[PDB]
């Protein structure tokens, strides 16, 4: 056989770069507080999401 290894013989931090975490993008479709459509915009002055 001809198999391959990569050994991080240095500080394990250099392997620690890669693993753990892997979160989702938590937000989901936001609903506006007026017409209750799913939002298309976020107002710069309130940060409220809105549609129409």
């Amino acid at each position: 056989c001809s198999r391959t290894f990569i050994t991080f013989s240095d500080d394990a931090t250099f392997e620690e770069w890669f693993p753990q975490g892997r979160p989702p993008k938590v937000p989901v479709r936001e609903v506006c507080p007026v017409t209750h459509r799913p939002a298309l915009y976020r107002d710069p002055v309130t940060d409220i999401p809105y549609a129409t």
Partner: peptide, 27 residues
């Protein structure tokens, strides 16, 4: 549609526009 007539630019040459207020957050 959005042709800017002599009128509208002479209008924006009137008293100045006020500043914004973007700091707040409520959602």
């Amino acid at each position: 549609r959005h042709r800017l007539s002599r009128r509208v630019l002479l209008e924006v040459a009137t008293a100045p526009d006020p500043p914004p207020r973007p700091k707040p957050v409520k959602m």
